[PDB]
């Protein structure tokens, strides 16, 4: 019997996270080719093949890259044993949740990035990529949804968020914790997300050319209603409020979003507060105003779900149910 | 000798957390530590906190400093971190100003408001509290007004100084202070609001994947004096937002790059050429905090180099 | 159809956590009777009955109380819909894990305490007890093992630990996070512990009169071997090391525990470090020395498992397997 | 004018983290910020750190202070928090002493040791680092030697000042310091180890349900000069342990109550009558930290009231 390693596909969306114990290779025009050459220890754990999907800073991540990724994984599922997606850290948490809601492929999808440049002292990218491959290759990684692997830790795509502007340990599942820790190429999984994901969602992006327009507005003392008014005047399909405290709104932002909801604009109350749910049954009478409470979804994560909800329905009661199940 | 208690003034901005002259009744243990007098400044949910209440408060503390030994400000939790930093920069009174709220209603099981008020008054009464700037006292902890922020939507322990930690912990009506803010505050600032009836218009825009430039453009078209960006990661901007704010920063709109990320600095010398664009990096000030210091910076200067030095010192 | 509330039994082990909006009742000699009168809102959610098992400070918690509790729950399971155990906070995390490993009853067991005295301003006990009852009454609480409810949060008995000496928010599942948050009497459960618990363990305490002798020793610079020697000289069945870093031992403590393991004393390496696993395959050659690595079990939690392991086997390979499954 | 770099001395206590004269090679960016000279003091895993190495180090820094502008101590992570506090109390040199280690081997993928060393040397070279006591630099953060502790078994970000927060963050070879330890350190302590070849014997005992008194009794029978209790909760003791330590505290054994709980003070005026029993409360010092200050307190006094005041000031 021949030992056979799993086939893992690396989909690249940006710059390389591994590069400058340096392996000696000829740098080519394809970033993902350079990455794999930078981390030759990948051969000990997987048969790796890399495709460069786009090449952007994740601060310029957008709906089209999302649809391109979901469709590619869903189309390519039978050709590999697992996927690693190399991504900028700034919006990795949004991409991860979009893919958590739209991937129908039943093999592991693992997102990975680097908080330090590949050229810097003590670059984190090489060992992060090695651990993302470990994760993607582990049969125990299946049926856990789309994952993020950073800093030796397996994180679910729904709760993971960037907590610190610079720290290599920045990625944390701040409400419900990580799924498993990685030591010496092995994962001890003690949790799985209960919210429905991947093949258990109704979201089917296979034929979509675009996503519903959903914008985010911020609340603070003496908040302007000019941003909320701008999104309404453009006919936005939905607005996510980054509310103060438990999803509360400055009165002038409240007044604009109540009027919008009455015309049929979907309105989701989230919070600028970095941990904890925007709860139903607090100080806002959601049912009266036609508003949706986001739960533990932060504003950027609430936008991802609301866009997908709006491919299915514009009924705020149906949108609330989606916000309570996914 | 007759033992004398310090005179503490509670200024109320909302409902009761434990009305405002009543509080000697509601928490009678306050009589053991202070002579408390109460005044109602305004009565609003802090989600509707505004520039007018800020100016009223700074003016009230500054004018009434001689009359009392310390102030406690009762306030809603939602925007307490904004008001604390606003007062931190505009108070000139050299006596403790301590903000306090409650995460559970006064009428609720295990309401946190009573003990929080008790510990706020302990803090305002402690001579060791002087010269530490405006404070926030919540869950047995003394927090500096610059770093303090609401970290959880519902948890009584929500208030944390998430970058530099608390100044002290309160046990048995005593504080063991082990820290004090280095950044300049109170009477070491140039900000003097004694004569202002309004503050510069400063708006906040959010960054995320596929971010619309319509918010940024709505503020630029209104002639806002400044815009704070809640950027991604290390203060980065979605391209369309970056385009609009690059245009604003050379047309009379100050632009501060902050971050939607809950901890850590938005740094100079990262991915953004701040000098080319006329932008200011916020450092550890989160977007709503950076808004406070931008509004106060704009009372003094419109020069981006000068605003960046204010962001570097306060 | 009559609305019927669940029957919940409160087993008390110490002082009351609710007492001095004060309800007016006559204080009796039974602490748990006074507790229920202190929290009259319990009637809105449950038919509550209370038994005082012992009355101790949890700093004096001990094996006999553990056996008395497991046997009482296992014997009384058919007489109620759920159990709340009122306990001191100091050792609640140890009790919770013991009960997580020995309860065979398939109804919720929820442990609760208070970080402030029942008589103090802003006492936490009343609302904690109300939330423990909510938890014990929720059908969604079943099959999650033994639980701790503190500060509006449902925590699994394995990972929960006391993180702060005074904070009402002190209880956290520091490695894998909470199971669910409680808002307005309702729980949004998003996690369940993967490690085997309750009816899926082999531990059966029904007939035990005592538990194997397991002690704990601490590592630090210039550590004394006198404590480890004392436990060996007494014929302790097991020793748990609170190691430095990844379960490392000062050489003189190492030497004493290696000699002990050779005579058949079970030795488990844990860590004084408050988060993270004591891993296999680090700097200690466990297999050579006959040592067991504790994983994410802190020293006090490793003792609870090792005592129960030693009712089943004294084979260090079998004890490791138990430390990898429960 | 010719620009001059500061002279930095690395003292090594173990293997390389990036031998000790080599490190100018291994991290050549060090040549841009300092003139580095390396000396090997000892070469041990920090799990075997001991009183002899502590005395050697304090004596070496104190004697060699004039010779250099700053020291970096390379050390194993397991007992770094103990050595840092020991040096924090015994260093009299008024120049920065910065400890550093690595959570991944030098030979491992994405080893943390290089950048950690680079940032340690930045810290030791910064004039702003002076007068802040002995420091620990790990994961882009400057941490005070009193509060710093290892919070995770394997995480590169393990070192945190868990009660009072970091002093500053390091970005692009610069530090923005916003805090400094209030507790007395270095040349503001009475502890002088220049003439000591040994330290008082101080042992640590653990509390948990059904705790054996055999550890405590083994230390008492050996005639230990002090015992630190890693108590439950707020420094509480299992009854049998309490009985043995109550006996010790009036028979020539100093007893400090600390806590196995990872954050928060063991307070005076809680469940234990410290005065009746002759016990000392450790405050925020965790058991291994309290051991350091007890050993140094016992060089000066055996009086429990006097030890408690040392625990209240250092």
From Swiss-Prot, chains A, C:
Quaternary structure, from the entry: Homotetramer.
Residue pairs linked by disulfide bridges in the UniProt entry: 77-105
Compartment(s) where it occurs, according to its Swiss-Prot or TrEMBL record: Periplasm
UniProt protein name: L-asparaginase 2
Catalytic activity, as annotated: L-asparagine + H2O = L-aspartate + NH4(+)
Gene transcribed to yield this protein: ansB
Keywords, alphabetical: Disulfide bond, Hydrolase, Periplasm, Pharmaceutical, Signal
Residues binding substrate: 58-59, 89-90
Gene Ontology molecular function terms on file: asparaginase activity; identical protein binding
């Amino acid at each position: 019997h021949h030992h056979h390693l799993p086939n893992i596909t690396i989909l690249a969306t940006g710059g390389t996270i591994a590069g400058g114990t340096k392996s000696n290779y000829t740098v080519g025009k394809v970033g993902v080719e350079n990455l794999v050459n930078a981390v030759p220890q990948l051969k000990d754990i997987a048969n790796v093949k890399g495709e460069q999907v786009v090449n952007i800073g994740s601060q310029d991540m957008n709906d089209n890259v999302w649809l391109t990724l979901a469709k590619k994984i869903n189309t390519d599922c039978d050709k590999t044993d697992g996927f690693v997606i190399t991504h900028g850290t700034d919006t990795m948490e949004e991409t991860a949740y979009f893919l958590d809601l739209t991937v129908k492929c039943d093999k592991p999808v693992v997102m990975v990035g680097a908080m330090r440049p590949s050229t810097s002292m003590s670059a984190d990218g090489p060992f992060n990529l090695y651990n993302a491959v470990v994760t993607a290759a582990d049969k125990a990684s299946a049926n856990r949804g789309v994952l993020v692997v950073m800093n030796d830790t397996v994180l679910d795509g729904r709760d993971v968020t960037k907590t610190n502007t610079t720290d290599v340990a920045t990625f944390k599942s701040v409400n419900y914790g990580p799924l498993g820790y990685i030591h010496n190429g092995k994962i001890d999984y003690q949790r799985t997300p209960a919210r429905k994901h991947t093949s258990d969602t109704p979201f089917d992006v296979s034929k979509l050319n675009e996503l519903p327009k959903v914008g985010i507005v911020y609340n603070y003392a003496n908040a302007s209603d000019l941003p909320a008014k701008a999104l309404v005047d453009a006919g936005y399909d939905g607005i996510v409020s980054a509310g103060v405290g438990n999803g509360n709104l400055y009165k002038s932002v409240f007044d604009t979003l109540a009027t919008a909801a009455k015309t049929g604009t979907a309105v989701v109350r989230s919070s600028r507060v970095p941990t904890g749910a925007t709860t139903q049954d607090a100080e806002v009478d959601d049912a009266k105003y036609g508003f949706v409470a986001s739960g533990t979804l932060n504003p950027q994560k609430a936008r991802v779900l609301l866009q997908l909800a709006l491919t299915q329905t514009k009924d705020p009661q149906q949108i609330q149910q989606i916000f309570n199940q996914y």
